[PDB]
Amino acid sequence: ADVQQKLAELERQSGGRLGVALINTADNSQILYRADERFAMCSTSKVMAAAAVLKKSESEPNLLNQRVEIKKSDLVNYNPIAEKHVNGTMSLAELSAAALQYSDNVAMNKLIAHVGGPASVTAFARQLGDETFRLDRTEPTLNTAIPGDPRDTTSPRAMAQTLRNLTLGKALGDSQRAQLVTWMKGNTTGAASIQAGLPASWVVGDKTGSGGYGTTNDIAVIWPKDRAPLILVTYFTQPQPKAESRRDVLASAAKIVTDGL
Numbered sequence: 001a002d003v004q005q006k007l008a009e010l011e012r013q014s015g016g017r018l019g020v021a022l023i024n025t026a027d028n029s030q031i032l033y034r035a036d037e038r039f040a041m042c043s044t045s046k047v048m049a050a051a052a053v054l055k056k057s058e059s060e061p062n063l064l065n066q067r068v069e070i071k072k073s074d075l076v077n078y079n080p081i082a083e084k085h086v087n088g089t090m091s092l093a094e095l096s097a098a099a100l101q102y103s104d105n106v107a108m109n110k111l112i113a114h115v116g117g118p119a120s121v122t123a124f125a126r127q128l129g130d131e132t133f134r135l136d137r138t139e140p141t142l143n144t145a146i147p148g149d150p151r152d153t154t155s156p157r158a159m160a161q162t163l164r165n166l167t168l169g170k171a172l173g174d175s176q177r178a179q180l181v182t183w184m185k186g187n188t189t190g191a192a193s194i195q196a197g198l199p200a201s202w203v204v205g206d207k208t209g210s211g212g213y214g215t216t217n218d219i220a221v222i223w224p225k226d227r228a229p230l231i232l233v234t235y236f237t238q239p240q241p242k243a244e245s246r247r248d249v250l251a252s253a254a255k256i257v258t259d260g261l
């Protein structure tokens, strides 16, 4: 009751729509809030795309070293790493790291293209047992986050279950799983989101995202000090097309659902 009331109060205060799913692997419990509603994933979808490449690599060992041309024509709205490599190549490993750790949207597009496009990323999700996830579009349009639009959405429950599988479970081979985890732990973009609601000593691997309608998201694997890990999805979106980011709402949600652990 208490956690639910606190999340409803946070949602009310925020003015928007909040989705939370926490999986606590200590006792196999969950904390859920709007966990079966759809939310635009925005850049949190990059985890699935990187995982698809990692899966592909299991049957093509030299895949991560494969070189990909970066051209001016590849540039999109947010190219912090790719802009440095125009007219050269990046490896699929470098593209994965750039997508996950700097949220480079060119890098995401290369991951998407490599595996066959959004419908291939979606088919991968289905193969894992995630029947909720849908990647419809490429970057940058996948971030529009229009209310009522199912494109490029998932639910907090599904994404928490899938992230658990990918990082802590057996979706990926041991080398590939370790690589995903290392990439996520090295994320540079998440300090203001879930991490901001957790004690400083906890270790986090996360992937943030943002989009239209003030959409502000984060998904994380969390290793509390001397505890079994957690998986947390916090998705948030707002009524106004040009609403401001609210990373603080994600931090507040994280604090509410972890208080006491």
Ligand SMILES: *C(=O)N1C[C@H](NOS(=O)(=O)O)CC[C@H]1C(N)=O
Pocket (backbone or CB within 6 Å): 041, 042, 043, 044, 077, 078, 102, 103, 104, 105, 140, 143, 189, 207, 208, 209, 210, 211, 212
């Ligand atoms: C992902 O949501 N996109 C790419 C980039 N992500 O950075 S974030 O994860 O720190 O939000 C910027 C926002 C967004 C986009 N609109 O392209």
Ligand SMILES: [Cl-]
Pocket (backbone or CB within 6 Å): 198, 199, 200, 201
């Ligand atoms: Cl602290």
